[PDB]
């Protein structure tokens, strides 16, 4: 089981940095097995789903990256419009190194 304190902290901080504090009471994380995806978001239920099968492999920065990406879908919509990718780069200048560690971990054991 992944420590909830770490997840609560990253969620709160990312919501604050993405100027989504007005939606703070509605946004939550749920951990469950997902098929062919690391994370998803229910835009109606304001719920971020993290794949239970990959979560024990992730670093704290990787979790922060995943949560930032799903919240940017809540903020901007379905497609990675210019404003989406620039906000993601602003939070993660090392975006490229995060994604290579992310891919290597999805390859599993
Ligand atoms: Ni996306």
- Distance from the alpha carbon of residue 101 to the mean position of ligand 1, in angstroms: 18
- Distance from the alpha carbon of residue 3 to the mean position of ligand 1, in angstroms: 25
| Of 45, 47, 46, nearest in space to 32 by CA | 47
CATH number (domain holding residue 44):
3.30.2010.10
Q: Which long-range contacts (CB under 8 A, 24 or more apart) does 11-16 make?
A: 11/48, 11/67, 13/64, 14/64, 14/67, 14/68, 14/71, 14/91, 15/71
Method for this entry:
X-ray
d(CA 4, CA 91): 22
Contact 70/48 with Cβ under 8 angstroms? yes
d(CA 64, CA 10): 6
Instruction: Give the structural domain span for 21.
Output: 1-109
| Of 105, 60, 106, 67, nearest in space to 88 by CA | 67
- Distance from the alpha carbon of residue 68 to the mean position of ligand 1, in angstroms: 10
- Distance from the alpha carbon of residue 88 to the mean position of ligand 1, in angstroms: 11
Give Cα separations from 89 to 24, 33, 76, 95 (angstroms). 22, 28, 15, 7
For the record, the structure tokens of 39 come out as 């994370």
Domains held by the chain: number: 1
Query: What residue has token string 């990959």?
Result: 54
Give Cα separations from 85 to 11, 48, 79, 99 (angstroms). 19, 19, 10, 14
For the record, the structure tokens of 71 come out as 């919240």
């Amino acid at each position: 089981m992944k420590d909830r304190k770490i997840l609560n902290e990253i969620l709160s901080n990312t919501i604050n940095e993405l100027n989504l504090n007005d939606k703070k009471a509605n946004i939550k994380i749920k951990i469950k097995p997902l098929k062919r995806k690391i994370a998803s978001i229910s835009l109606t239920n304001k719920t971020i789903y993290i794949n239970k099968n990959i979560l024990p492999y992730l670093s704290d920065e990787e979790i922060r990256f995943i949560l930032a990406h799903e919240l940017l879908h809540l903020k901007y919509g379905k497609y990675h419009i210019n404003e989406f990718e620039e906000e993601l780069l602003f939070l993660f200048p090392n975006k490229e190194a995060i994604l290579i560690n992310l891919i290597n971990k999805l390859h599993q054991k």
